[PDB]
Amino acid sequence: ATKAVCVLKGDGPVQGTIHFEAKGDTVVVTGSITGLTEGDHGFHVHQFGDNTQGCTSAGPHFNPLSKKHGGPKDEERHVGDLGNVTADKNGVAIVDIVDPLISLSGEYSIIGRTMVVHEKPDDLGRGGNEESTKTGNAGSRLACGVIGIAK
């Protein structure tokens, strides 16, 4: 698979559609998220594509290599650590990330896993608390969706 799509939804007003496309040895993630409070929101690929208990059953960040929580540009980061998206004043976040770690096939494949958008910004593991090294203190999961194969 070279294209994927995720439809984010939650208990609230956050909603959005993320598109993934494999370009070379990177995956280009695009799309928009709306209903967000202006500012930065933790944006990560969680391990399971299980929406049976809302975004909760998505588990922790996808971390096949058992590293610590980082930001996208770090070497020591979870495969699903894609940092933060930024809602403008209108609550709209435009996603445009290019990641060399997440994949649409193979072991780091995120197909069948969940994209989660958080309440707070991802502190990128530079927070000075244990929590920061586990989730970046991004807090609650506002919206999430299972990543599926797209035409």
- Binding-site residues for Cu cation: 44, 46, 61, 118
19 is catalytic: no
Q: State which residue, 37 or 112, has the beta carbon closest to a copy of itself.
A: 112
Q: Which does 116 bind (CB under 5 to 8 A by kind): Zn ion, Cu ion, Ca ion, none?
A: Cu ion
44 is catalytic: yes
Phi-psi region of 108 (alpha: psi -120 to 50; beta: other; left: phi over 0): alpha
Structure tokens given for 128: 């000075």
Catalytic residue (choose from 81, 99, 122, 123): 81
| Residue from the set 41, 78, 120, 141 that interacts with Zn ion by CB under 5 A | 78
Candidates 135, 33, 12, 26; CA nearest to 85 is 33
41 is catalytic: no
* Cβ neighbours for 49, distance < 8 A, ≥ 6 positions apart: 58, 112, 113, 114, 146, 147
Binding track over 88-127 against Ca ion, x by CB under 5 A: -------------------------------x--------
Please answer whether residues 116 and 46 qualify as being in contact, where contact means their C-beta atoms are separated by less than 8 angstroms. Answer: yes
* Nearest-approach distance from CB 29 to a copy of itself, in angstroms: 15
* Nearest-approach distance from CB 4 to a copy of itself, in angstroms: 7
Please answer whether residues 120 and 43 qualify as being in contact, where contact means their C-beta atoms are separated by less than 8 angstroms. Answer: no
Please answer whether residues 51 and 146 qualify as being in contact, where contact means their C-beta atoms are separated by less than 8 angstroms. Answer: yes
Candidates 57, 123, 47; CA nearest to 78 is 47
| Residue from the set 23, 24, 52, 129 that interacts with a copy of itself by CB under 8 A | 52
**Residues making contact with a copy of itself (CB under 8 A):** 1, 4-5, 7, 17, 47-52, 59, 111-114, 145-151
Any idea which residues carry the catalytic annotation? Answer: 44, 46, 61, 69, 78, 81, 118, 141
